[PDB]
Design a protein around this ligand. Structure first.
Ligand SMILES: *[C@@H]1O[C@H](CO)[C@@H](O[C@@H]2O[C@H](CO)[C@@H](O[C@@H]3O[C@H](CO)[C@@H](O)[C@H](O)[C@@H]3O)[C@H](O)[C@H]2NC(C)=O)[C@H](O)[C@H]1NC(C)=O
Ligand SMILES: *[C@@H]1O[C@H](CO)[C@@H](O[C@@H]2O[C@H](CO)[C@@H](O)[C@H](O)[C@H]2NC(C)=O)[C@H](O)[C@H]1NC(C)=O
Ligand SMILES: *[C@@H]1O[C@H](CO)[C@@H](O[C@@H]2O[C@H](CO)[C@@H](O)[C@H](O)[C@H]2NC(C)=O)[C@H](O)[C@H]1NC(C)=O
Ligand SMILES: *[C@@H]1O[C@H](CO)[C@@H](O[C@@H]2O[C@H](CO)[C@@H](O)[C@H](O)[C@H]2NC(C)=O)[C@H](O)[C@H]1NC(C)=O
Ligand SMILES: *[C@@H]1O[C@H](CO)[C@@H](O[C@@H]2O[C@H](CO)[C@@H](O)[C@H](O)[C@H]2NC(C)=O)[C@H](O)[C@H]1NC(C)=O
Ligand SMILES: *[C@@H]1O[C@H](CO)[C@@H](O[C@@H]2O[C@H](CO)[C@@H](O)[C@H](O)[C@H]2NC(C)=O)[C@H](O)[C@H]1NC(C)=O
Ligand SMILES: *[C@@H]1O[C@H](CO)[C@@H](O[C@@H]2O[C@H](CO)[C@@H](O)[C@H](O)[C@H]2NC(C)=O)[C@H](O)[C@H]1NC(C)=O
Ligand SMILES: *[C@@H]1O[C@H](CO)[C@@H](O[C@@H]2O[C@H](CO)[C@@H](O)[C@H](O)[C@H]2NC(C)=O)[C@H](O)[C@H]1NC(C)=O
Ligand SMILES: *[C@@H]1O[C@H](CO)[C@@H](O)[C@H](O)[C@H]1NC(C)=O
Ligand SMILES: *[C@@H]1O[C@H](CO)[C@@H](O)[C@H](O)[C@H]1NC(C)=O
Ligand SMILES: *[C@@H]1O[C@H](CO)[C@@H](O)[C@H](O)[C@H]1NC(C)=O
Ligand SMILES: *[C@@H]1O[C@H](CO)[C@@H](O)[C@H](O)[C@H]1NC(C)=O
Ligand SMILES: *[C@@H]1O[C@H](CO)[C@@H](O)[C@H](O)[C@H]1NC(C)=O
Ligand SMILES: *[C@@H]1O[C@H](CO)[C@@H](O)[C@H](O)[C@H]1NC(C)=O
Lengths: 86, 35, 244, 99, 370, 49, 50, 34, 50
C-alpha cells in the first residue's frame, strides 16, 4: 500500500488494524495447504521397499515403480506428468 | 430490465425429462447392470 | 521567380489496398518480450489509399506518405491553411545537403519547384516572406521505399520515418515494419492542407512519373508485440474483425 | 505421452492464481481520482497538507483492491480444501481396500 | 519481540513470524544533464508593454537552468500561488517545454484565474483547463498601464456565439447579432461590437488599478527533460543500495551495468506495470539497470520459554552473504547456515536425520538438543 | 452504473479494470451451473425406451 | 462539483454491485455442494443397491 | 438464424444431430466442418 | 408532460381510472402513460439491448 514512505505509513496507521487480519488470513491459508498435502499423502507409518527381484505372476509395474537411474527417483508416468504441465 | 440479463440453461426441460425417462426405463428393465 | 505552364500534367490517382503499413513507435519507453495495448491515431488496416503516378490535399488528423522511389526525385513538403504570406505555413526542403525547415508566411505561385542546372544552382520555390519565427537545419532526410508519418498534436508536429530496400514492382509491399521517431517540432500551426515538391531538370521540365502513396489517419486501438530486442514486429488492429 | 490438454484442472487452477496476482499488481497503476499513480512524485512535488488528500485517495483505492483479492483467495481455498478432503477419502477407500 | 507481538509472557514451542527487514540505503546520487546556462526571466518579467487579455502573450521556455528563489522572495508580486506543485519545491524538479503567458487584466477578475471558474474574461477572453498545473503571479500595474487620458489599448470580449475551450487565442472582431433580424454585417439595433475597451485612469483607486499577470505552465514527464533546477550533480556508484535521482526520476535501489540493447531515441525501460528496469544517465549516456535492494520477512524458532531462553532466527528468502531490526549481536561469530528457505542464525546443522518437531521449510526442520 | 452517460464513463475510467474482474466471476458461475446439471443427469451413454 | 456528485453515485453503486457478486459466489458454493451430493446419491442409489 | 437464445449470423442450420462442441444455448450448439 | 424516458411506444389496453396520469408496475419503473393532448392510454417498452 505505501512502499517505504513514513508519511504513508502514518496515514495508514489511523485506519485501525485493517491489515493484521489480512496477514492472519494469508498465513492460515498457507498452513492449510501444508495440512492438506500432509493428510492426503502421509497415510503410512513406515517406508516399505519392493524386493530387488520382482516376479508378480506376470504383471509389469516397471512404468510405475521408481527407476534408480533417474536422480529424481520418479517413475516414468510421473516424469511424463511433471514435464507436460508448466 | 436495467442492464441485467438472464441466460437460458443449456439443457431444455424436455431433454432433462428424456434423461430421466432413459434412466428409469433402464433400471426397470436391466437393473444395476446397465450402470 | 516562376512562370505558368501549359502541359497540365495530371496524375491518375488510383486506389490500392493499405494492408499493414503505418505502424510507429508510440512512446520513448523501452520494452521487451511483451504484448502492449495502446490507443492512438493510426492508419486502419486493409483500407484504401490513393496512389498517384500537384494537387492540394487536406491534412485532416494525420497523413501517411510513402514513395517507393528511384533516384530520390521527391524533394520537399509544404503545409498550412491557404499557402500565402497572409497565414503562417510550414516548409521542409531536403536537398543534397542538410535538410532545412522553416515556419514562415511564404508567398507561393501556382507551382513551386527547385529546378536543377547542369554545378547545380537553382531555387525559385517561393517569392516573398514577410515575418516568421522558427527555422531549423539538420541531417538530410534521404528502388528504396521511404515511409513518413506526419502528426500534428498539442502544438507538436511529430514526423516519423523509415527506409527499406524494395524490389517489388508496384503494390505496397506485403510486409510489416515499425516507424521509428525522427523529429519533433515544438510549434503549433493550424495545419489542414499540404502540397508536394519535386526536382525537375530545368535546362524544360521532364518529370511525370511522380508515383507516391497517400493516406489519412483515424483514432483506433492496437495490440503490439515487442520481441526480446524491443523491436515492434507484430500488431493487431481491434475494430476490424470479430476475430480481431 | 501424446494427447495434450489432459490435465485441465491443475492447469486452470494455476491460471486462476496467476490471473489474480496479475490483476492485483496491475491495479497499482490507477489514479483512483488522484493526480498521479506514483506516490514518490506527489511526495516530491507538492505541500504535505494536500499530500494528505492525494495519499488518502491512493490508500482507500489500494485497500479496496487488496480486500477483494483476499476474499477471492478465501473462497478458492475453501474449494481446494473440499477437493483435498475428497482425495483423502478416495485414497483411503480405493487404494487401501476394495470399494 | 515474540512476546510483544503474541501478547503473552509465556510463549509455546513453535515458529512465529515477528517482522520484516529491509536493507537500508546508503548515501545518495543526484545526476542531472551537464548543460548549464542562465534562464532568461528578466525580459518576460520586465517587458515595458503588454497586450490585451484576448491577445495574451505566450512564450516558450526551454534549454535553460532556472532558479525560482528570486521569483519567490520578490515581495513586489501581489499574488503568488501554485496549484499542482509546492512553491518551495520548484527549484527541486526538472521539466521540459515550460510556458509563460503574460497579460494585463482586471484585479477584480484575478479570482477568475482558476480551474472550474466562470466569469467575464474566464469564459470570453481566456479559459484555464480544469487540470491546470503550474503557478500564477499578479501585481499591481496602475503606474504603468493607466494614464490620465485613459488607456484604451486594452480591449476585452463581451459577446460570443459560444464559450471558450481552455487555452485558446481569439481575436476575431466580428459584429454580434443580438436579435432575430440579421445584422448582415451592418451595426445597428441588436447589433453590437463584442469588444469593449478598458478606461484605466489613475483617478480610480484599488479595484480599478490595472494588474499585470504571468502564468507559468509545466509538463510532467512527456518528453526528455530540458529545464532542470539549480541543483548540482554528483558522482554515481554501483553495487550498493542507494537513493538515486536520475533527472527528476527518484528511486531507491542498487544500480548495475545493464546488458539490454537500447535504441538511440529510447531513454529508459520497463516490463510490467511501471517497473523502471533501466536508465540512461544524462551525463555519461550509459545504460544501467535498477533493482530494489533486498528485503524479506523474519521468523523465530524457540523450544518454548518454559524450557530455555535460546532462539534461532531465520531470514526468509535472503542470501546469507549480507544480513547485518539492528540485531548485530547475531552477526559476530554465531553459527550461520543457508537453506532454500533463507538463512538460519543460531542453529547448527547435523548429519543424522529423524522425525522432527517445529518445521522450517523445503524439508528442513529443527528442534532442541543448543 | 452510468446509465448511458459519457462523463460518467470517463470518470469511471480511472478506477482501473474493476468491471472485467467482476464479469469474470459471473461467467464462472454460469459454466458451473451447466456442469452441475450435466454431471447430475447425464449418467448414461445411451437412451433406452 | 458535478463530478464530485457523480463520484459519490459511482462509489455507492460499486459497493452495491460488489456485495451482490460476493453473495452470488457464496450461494453458488452452497448449490455446488448440494449438486455433488445429488450426483453421488443418484449414482449410488439409482444405479445400484446401497 | 433466429433461435431461443438470440440471433446467429454466419452459421448454417442443419437437421442432423451430433455431440455438442461449442454450447450455444437452449439445446443447440455449433461446430466446424464452414 | 415532464415525464422523461426512452423506449418504444405502443397502444395499450389497460384501463386507467378517470383521474390518473400514468402507471407503473413495480420497483418504481414507469410502464404506461396517457397523452396530454388526446388523453389516450399508451404502453412503454425499453428498446432491446444485449
Ligand atoms: C484553421 O483552418 C481551418 C481551415 O483550414 C479553419 O476552419 C474553417 O475556416 C473557414 C475559413 O473561411 C471557415 O469558413 C467560414 O468560416 C466562418 C467563420 O467560422 C463562417 O461564419 C462561414 O460560414 C464559413 O464557414 C470554416 O467554417 C471553418 N471550419 C471549421 C470547422 O472551423 C479554422 O477556423 C482555422 N482555425 C482553427 C483554430 O482551426
Ligand atoms: C515388464 O514390462 C516392461 C514394460 O516396459 C518391460 O520393459 C521393457 O524393457 C525392455 C528393455 O529395456 C524394452 O526393450 C521394452 O521395450 C520394454 N517394454 C515396453 C512395453 O516398452 C519389462 O522388461 C517387463 N519385465 C519383464 C519382461 O521381466
Ligand atoms: C540546399 O543546400 C544548400 C547547401 O548547404 C543549403 O542552402 C544554404 O546553405 C548555406 C551553407 O550551409 C547556408 O548558410 C544557408 O542558410 C542555406 N540556405 C537556407 C535557405 O537555409 C541548404 O542545405 C539547402 N537549401 C535550402 C533547403 O533552401
Ligand atoms: C509581419 O509583416 C506583416 C505584413 O505587413 C504584418 O502584418 C500587418 O502589418 C501592418 C504594418 O503596418 C500592420 O498595420 C497590421 O496590423 C499587420 N497585420 C497583422 C495581421 O499582423 C505583421 O504585423 C508583421 N509582424 C508579425 C509579427 O507578423
Ligand atoms: C537482437 O540483436 C542481437 C544482436 O544485437 C541478435 O544477436 C544475433 O545472434 C545471432 C546468433 O548467433 C548471430 O548470428 C547474429 O550475428 C547476432 N546479431 C548481430 C547483429 O550480431 C539477436 O538475434 C536479436 N534478437 C532477435 C532478432 O530476436
Ligand atoms: C525585473 O526588473 C527588476 C528591477 O530592475 C528586477 O529586480 C531586481 O531588484 C534588485 C533589488 O531591487 C536589483 O538589485 C536587481 O539588479 C534587479 N534585477 C535585475 C535583473 O535588474 C527583477 O529581477 C527583474 N526580473 C527578473 C525576472 O529578473
Ligand atoms: C549468495 O551470493 C554469492 C555471491 O554472489 C553467491 O556465490 C556465487 O555463487 C555462484 C553460483 O551460485 C558462483 O558461480 C559464484 O562463483 C559465487 N560467487 C560470487 C558470484 O562471487 C551465492 O551463490 C549466493 N547464494 C545463493 C543461495 O544464491
Ligand atoms: C384539444 O381540444 C379540441 C377540442 O375541440 C380537440 O378537437 C377535437 O377533439 C376531438 C376529441 O379529442 C377529436 O375527435 C377531433 O378530431 C378534434 N378536432 C379538432 C379540429 O381538433 C383537439 O383534438 C384537442 N387536441 C389538440 C391538439 O388540439
Ligand atoms: C476504398 O476501398 C475499397 C475496398 O475494396 C475499394 O474497392 C475502393 O475502390 C476504395 N475507394 C473508394 C473511393 O471507395
Ligand atoms: C506533358 O507531361 C507529361 C507528363 O510528364 C508527358 O508524358 C508529356 O510528354 C508532356 N507533353 C509535352 C508536350 O511536354
Ligand atoms: C558533460 O559536461 C561535462 C563538463 O561540462 C563533461 O566533462 C562531460 O564529458 C560532458 N558529457 C559528455 C557526454 O561529453
Ligand atoms: C514446564 O514444563 C514442566 C515439565 O514439562 C511442567 O511441569 C511445568 O508445569 C511447565 N511450566 C508451565 C508454566 O506449565
Ligand atoms: C556429515 O558430516 C561430515 C563431516 O565429517 C560432512 O563432511 C558432511 O557434509 C555431513 N553431511 C551431512 C548430510 O550432514
Ligand atoms: C429440416 O428442418 C426443417 C425445419 O422444419 C424442415 O423444413 C426441413 O424439411 C428439414 N429437412 C431438411 C433436409 O432441411
Amino acid at each position: 500500500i505505501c512502499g517505504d514512505s513514513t508519511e504513508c505509513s502514518n496515514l495508514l496507521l489511523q485506519y485501525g488494524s485493517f491489515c493484521t487480519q489480512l496477514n492472519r488470513a494469508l498465513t492460515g491459508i498457507a498452513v492449510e495447504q501444508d495440512k492438506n498435502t500432509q493428510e492426503v499423502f502421509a497415510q503410512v507409518k513406515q517406508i516399505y521397499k519392493t524386493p530387488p527381484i520382482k516376479d508378480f505372476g506376470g504383471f509389469n509395474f516397471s512404468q510405475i515403480l521408481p527407476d534408480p537411474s533417474k536422480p529424481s527417483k520418479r517413475s516414468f508416468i510421473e516424469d511424463l506428468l511433471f514435464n507436460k504441465v508448466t | 430490465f436495467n442492464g441485467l440479463t438472464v441466460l437460458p440453461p443449456l439443457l431444455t426441460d424436455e431433454m432433462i425429462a428424456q434423461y430421466t425417462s432413459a434412466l428409469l426405463a433402464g433400471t426397470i428393465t436391466s437393473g444395476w447392470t446397465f450402470g | 521567380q516562376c512562370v505558368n505552364f501549359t502541359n497540365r500534367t495530371q496524375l491518375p490517382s488510383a486506389y490500392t489496398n493499405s494492408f499493414t503499413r503505418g505502424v510507429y513507435y508510440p512512446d520513448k519507453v523501452f520494452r521487451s518480450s511483451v504484448l502492449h495495448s495502446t490507443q492512438d491515431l493510426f492508419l486502419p488496416f486493409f483500407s484504401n489509399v490513393t496512389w498517384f503516378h500537384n494537387p492540394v490535399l487536406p491534412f485532416n488528423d494525420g497523413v501517411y506518405f510513402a514513395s517507393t522511389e528511384k533516384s530520390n526525385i521527391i524533394r520537399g513538403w509544404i503545409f498550412g491553411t491557404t499557402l500565402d504570406s497572409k497565414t503562417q505555413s510550414l516548409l521542409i526542403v531536403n536537398n543534397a545537403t542538410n535538410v532545412v525547415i522553416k515556419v514562415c508566411e511564404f508567398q507561393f505561385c501556382n507551382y513551386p519547384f527547385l529546378g536543377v542546372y547542369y554545378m547545380e544552382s537553382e531555387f525559385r520555390v517561393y517569392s516573398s516572406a514577410n515575418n516568421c519565427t522558427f527555422e531549423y537545419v539538420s541531417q538530410p532526410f534521404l528502388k528504396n521505399l521511404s515511409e513518413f508519418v506526419f502528426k500534428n498534436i498539442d502544438g507538436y508536429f511529430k514526423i516519423y520515418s523509415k527506409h527499406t530496400p524494395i524490389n517489388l514492382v508496384r503494390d505496397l509491399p506485403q510486409g510489416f515494419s515499425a516507424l521509428e521517431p525522427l523529429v519533433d517540432l515544438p510549434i503549433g500551426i493550424n495545419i489542414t492542407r499540404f502540397q508536394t515538391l519535386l526536382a525537375l531538370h530545368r535546362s524544360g521540365w521532364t518529370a511525370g512519373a511522380a508515383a507516391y502513396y497517400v493516406g489519412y489517419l483515424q483514432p483506433r486501438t492496437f495490440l503490439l508485440k515487442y520481441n526480446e530486442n524491443g523491436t515492434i514486429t507484430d500488431a493487431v488492429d481491434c475494430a476490424l474483425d470479430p476475430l480481431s | 505421452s501424446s494427447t495434450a490438454s489432459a490435465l485441465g484442472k491443475l492447469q486452470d487452477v494455476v491460471n486462476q492464481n496467476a490471473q489474480a496476482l496479475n490483476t492485483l499488481v496491475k491495479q497499482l497503476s490507477s489514479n483512483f481520482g488522484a493526480i498521479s499513480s506514483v506516490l514518490n512524485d506527489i511526495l516530491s512535488r507538492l505541500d504535505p497538507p494536500e499530500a494528505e488528500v492525494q495519499i488518502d485517495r491512493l490508500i482507500t483505492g489500494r485497500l479496496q483492491s487488496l480486500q477483494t483479492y483476499v476474499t477471492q483467495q478465501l473462497i478458492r481455498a475453501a474449494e481446494i480444501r473440499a477437493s483435498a478432503n475428497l482425495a483423502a477419502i478416495k485414497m483411503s477407500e480405493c487404494v487401501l481396500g476394495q470399494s | 519481540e515474540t512476546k510483544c507481538t503474541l501478547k503473552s509472557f509465556t510463549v509455546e514451542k513453535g515458529i512465529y513470524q515477528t517482522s520484516n527487514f529491509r536493507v537500508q540505503p546508503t548515501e545518495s546520487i543526484v545526476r542531472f544533464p551537464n548543460i548549464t546556462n542562465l534562464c532568461p526571466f528578466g525580459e518576460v518579467f520586465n517587458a515595458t508593454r503588454f497586450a490585451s487579455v484576448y491577445a495574451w502573450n505566450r512564450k516558450r521556455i526551454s534549454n535553460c537552468v532556472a532558479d525560482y528563489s528570486v521569483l519567490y522572495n520578490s515581495a513586489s508580486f501581489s499574488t503568488f500561488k501554485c496549484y499542482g506543485v509546492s512553491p518551495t519545491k520548484l527549484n527541486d524538479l526538472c521539466f521540459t517545454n515550460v510556458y509563460a503567458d503574460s497579460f494585463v487584466i482586471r484585479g477584480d477578475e484575478v479570482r477568475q484565474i482558476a480551474p472550474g471558474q466562470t466569469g467575464t474574461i474566464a469564459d470570453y477572453n481566456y479559459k484555464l483547463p480544469d487540470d491546470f498545473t503550474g503557478c500564477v503571479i499578479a501585481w499591481n500595474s496602475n503606474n504603468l498601464d493607466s494614464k490620465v487620458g485613459g488607456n484604451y489599448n486594452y480591449l476585452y470580449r463581451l459577446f460570443r456565439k459560444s464559450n471558450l475551450k481552455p487555452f485558446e487565442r481569439d481575436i476575431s472582431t466580428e459584429i454580434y447579432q443580438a436579435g432575430s433580424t440579421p445584422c448582415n454585417g451592418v451595426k445597428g439595433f441588436n447589433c453590437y461590437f463584442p469588444l469593449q475597451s478598458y478606461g484605466f485612469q489613475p483617478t480610480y483607486g484599488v479595484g480599478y488599478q490595472p494588474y499585470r499577470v504571468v502564468v507559468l505552465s509545466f509538463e510532467l514527464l512527456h518528453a526528455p527533460a530540458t529545464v532542470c533546477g539549480p541543483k548540482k550533480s554528483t558522482n554515481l556508484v554501483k553495487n550498493k543500495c542507494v537513493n538515486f535521482n536520475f533527472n527528476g526520476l527518484t528511486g531507491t535501489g542498487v544500480l548495475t551495468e545493464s546488458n539490454k540493447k537500447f535504441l538511440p531515441f529510447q531513454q529508459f525501460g520497463r516490463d510490467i506495470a511501471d517497473t523502471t528496469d533501466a536508465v540512461r544517465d544524462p551525463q555519461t549516456l550509459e545504460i544501467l539497470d535498477i533493482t530494489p535492494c533486498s528485503f524479506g520477512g523474519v521468523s523465530v524458532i524457540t523450544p518454548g520459554t518454559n524450557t530455555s531462553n535460546q532462539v534461532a532466527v531465520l531470514y526468509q528468502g535472503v542470501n546469507c552473504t549480507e544480513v547485518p531490526p539492528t540485531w548485530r549481536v547475531y552477526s559476530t561469530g554465531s553459527n550461520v547456515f543457508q537453506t532454500r528457505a533463507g538463512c538460519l542464525i543460531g542453529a547448527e546443522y547435523v548429519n543424522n536425520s529423524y522425525e522432527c518437531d517445529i518445521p522450517i521449510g523445503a524439508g528442513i526442520c529443527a528442534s532442541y538438543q543448543s
